[PDB]
């Protein structure tokens, strides 16, 4: 509903920033969560405007609405407010006025997701290709068995990466603050703190 037009109470101008190249191997929003088939970015990290996303959504919908129990999950919201000065105006003299909403999209991230009752995968693939024709990146069809993109030419299965209880790890190799707290909890300090 509000993914292409956030309702920040205090509307305000924003700096340009940069699209996060996720050097640490994030895989956040790079996985199929809601649907069966999806459309992910394949190229370098890119900014997608609100209008472009809306058009991609519309393109996908043409295939989704005919389906029985058809659904489209829009995974990303255009949260960054972009202002622009005109091409007509000189440089300097303040910042330009609000123009459009935009989203910073890392390399591996999923944009859309679909799942119908009577949806064959070929149709879904076609729809997602047609959606990709309207967006500024280069995109890729992603199924539930197809594995998570991280880099431009690199891949990963989330099933593989290890599970860890971090409290236990902390206890094993404790910080100074934690040790101080533990000492405080002990009786030779707790009795004589005198509050």
């Amino acid at each position: 509903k509000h993914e292409y037009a956030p309702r920040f109470k205090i509307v305000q101008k924003k700096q340009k920033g940069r699209v996060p190249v996720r050097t640490g191997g994030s895989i956040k929003g790079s996985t199929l969560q809601f649907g069966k088939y999806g459309l992910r970015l394949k190229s370098e990290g890119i900014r997608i405007s609100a209008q472009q996303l809306k058009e991609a959504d519309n393109a996908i919908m043409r295939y989704v609405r005919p389906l029985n129990n058809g659904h489209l999950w829009r995974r990303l919201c255009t949260n960054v407010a972009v202002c622009i000065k005109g091409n007509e105006t000189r440089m300097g003299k303040g910042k330009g006025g609000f123009d459009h909403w935009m989203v910073r999209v890392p390399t591996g991230k999923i944009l859309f997701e679909i799942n119908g009752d009577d949806l064959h995968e070929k149709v879904a693939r076609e729809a997602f290709r047609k959606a990709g024709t309207k967006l500024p990146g280069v995109y890729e069809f992603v199924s539930l068995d197809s594995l998570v993109r991280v880099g431009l030419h690199s891949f990963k299965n989330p099933k593989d990466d290890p599970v860890k209880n971090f409290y236990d790890e902390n206890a094993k190799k404790p910080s100074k603050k934690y040790l101080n707290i533990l000492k405080s909890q002990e009786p030779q300090y707790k009795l004589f703190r005198g509050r």
Partner: protein, 113 residues
Amino acid sequence: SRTSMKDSAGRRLGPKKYEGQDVSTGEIIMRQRGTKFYPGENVGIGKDHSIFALEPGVVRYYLDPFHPKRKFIGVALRRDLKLPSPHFEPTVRRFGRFELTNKRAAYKEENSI
């Protein structure tokens, strides 16, 4: 047009004296906005929460179990002392005065009340 071209300068609010550093009485160990560091052993605190040394010694940053979730800056009277000092041991104190070996000076001091 109307531009937002106005800002105060930076308040120089780092630590002004570091761990293991020799100090003198009066010297500022920390400038800060509110007690990020609390005044520890042999150390005072000012109006602007500025930690300053009460005695000559060695600046030490530490945690104390009595005050968990609070960082401290104190001044150890020597380099030998671990400045979160043992609680039930006697306080390491500095006399900090000198006897008036000079006779006249001693006499003057005796006279003065």
